[PDB]
Amino acid sequence: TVHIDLSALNPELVQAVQHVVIGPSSLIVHFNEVICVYHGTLLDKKIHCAVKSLNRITDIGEVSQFLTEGIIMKDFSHPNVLSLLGICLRSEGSPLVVLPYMKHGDLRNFIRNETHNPTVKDLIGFGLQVAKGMKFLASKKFVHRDLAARNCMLDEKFTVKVADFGLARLPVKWMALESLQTQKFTTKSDVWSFGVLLWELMTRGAPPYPDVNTFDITVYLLQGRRLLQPEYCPDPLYEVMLKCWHPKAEMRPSFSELVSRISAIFSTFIGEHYVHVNATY
Ligand SMILES: Cn1cc(-c2ccc3nnc(Sc4ccc5ncccc5c4)n3n2)cn1
Ligand SMILES: [Cl-]
């Protein structure tokens, strides 16, 4: 029930965030059409968008951090990274985050869907797109911390966008050994998660370590274990996954190396090997 006067904001920051701000007459939010996220329309040209309605922000410092995140995220521009279209801050501190509409939803549900018929080539292609997204994010010194198939999205062109970061924001079965032990995250721990994401792809969305207790992952891994090679995962791609899970963080490949290696493996396929679901998954 706290009142907030937005005019108490620093005029320099308000000026700095203007290119991120969407005018009230530029966006028609379809509160009737619910995806808390709603369908929206943006003008440029009618543009379909996803409008994430955040909880009301009643602290000027929090409003300030919201506007600052918006500015930084606005410059995270890449074909395989979810873009911020802009932000709205309504009267009384009610925020809207405007993101591009993702027609085919999250990548995990997409590959799981038994009516979709992915090939080995399709699935590796998805992995490659994610690696390109991550190569970009790493170049910006941005550590994702929650990379997973569920956290990537697909548009109408089947372009994969790394999402669930910034204003679009423990996953222990995607976490590197050193992160489980120290609670610190790096680009090299994102590479570990990317390895698990590749496993998710080649299994068409199977949960990693099915019979394994969430609380018991460090002890499991320390017995000398890794995720098994999926039935439809090519040997060189499984070798890549094993490199992503190297016990020495510094010995794991960079995302730039992953893009290179995966592009090569991808190139050898012609879209003739269909990927079917594991009976046990
Ligand atoms: C199961 N699931 C995971 C997600 C998801 C993932 C990452 C992520 N990063 N930002 C968002 S919000 C968003 C953004 C665009 C959308 N486009 C279409 C439908 C839903 C949409 C939701 N997400 N949403 C949605 N369902
Ligand atoms: Cl294929």
What single string gives the DSSP state of each residue in 15-39?
Answer: HHTTTTBPPTTTEEEEEEEE--EEE
Residues in the annotated binding site for ATP: 35-37, 52
Query: Measured in Å, how far apart are the chain's first and last C-alpha atoms?
Result: 48
At a CB cut-off of 8 Å and minimum separation 6, what does 155 contact? 100, 101, 102, 103, 104, 161
Find residue 90's DSSP bridge partners: 94
Which ligand 1 atom minimizes the distance to the CA of 168? 10
- Interval between CA 11 and ligand 1 midpoint (Å): 33
What does the alpha-carbon distance between residue 23 and residue 5 come to, in Å, rounded to a whole number? 19
What DSSP state is assigned to residue 76? Answer: -
Which ligand 1 atom minimizes the distance to the CA of 52? 12
Which ligand 1 atom minimizes the distance to the CA of 164? 9
What does the alpha-carbon distance between residue 38 and residue 97 come to, in Å, rounded to a whole number? 10
Angle between helices 235-244 and 255-267 (to 10 degrees): 170
Nearest to 203 by CA among 175, 172, 237: 237
- Interval between CA 106 and ligand 1 midpoint (Å): 6
| Mutational test site, ligand 1, from 85, 153, 169, max ligand atoms within 8 Å of CB | 153
Looking at the chain, list the stretches that DSSP marks H as alpha helix, in order from N- to C-terminal side: 11-16, 60-74, 107-112, 120-139, 177-182, 187-202, 217-222, 235-244, 255-267
Q: Find where tokens 């003739």 sit.
A: 272
- Contact (Cβ atoms closer than 8 angstroms) between residue 36 and residue 97: no
CA atoms within 13 A on the CB side of 188: 14
- Interval between CA 199 and ligand 1 midpoint (Å): 21
- Contact (Cβ atoms closer than 8 angstroms) between residue 216 and residue 197: no
Q: Check if 99 has its Cβ closer than 6 Å to any atom of ligand 1.
A: yes
248-280 burial, b at 16+ Cβ within 10 Å, e below that, comes to ebeebbebeebbebbeebbeebeeeeebeeeee
Domains and CATH numbers, the chain: 12-101 (3.30.200.20), 102-281 (1.10.510.10)
Q: Check if 152 has its Cβ closer than 6 Å to any atom of ligand 1.
A: no
- Contact (Cβ atoms closer than 8 angstroms) between residue 198 and residue 127: yes
Phi then psi for residue 206, to 5 deg, are: -70, 145
- Contact (Cβ atoms closer than 8 angstroms) between residue 191 and residue 98: no
At a CB cut-off of 8 Å and minimum separation 6, what does 113 contact? none
What does the alpha-carbon distance between residue 178 and residue 191 come to, in Å, rounded to a whole number? 12
| CA 105, chain centre distance (Å) | 12
Find residue 86's DSSP bridge partners: 98
Find residue 37's DSSP bridge partners: 52
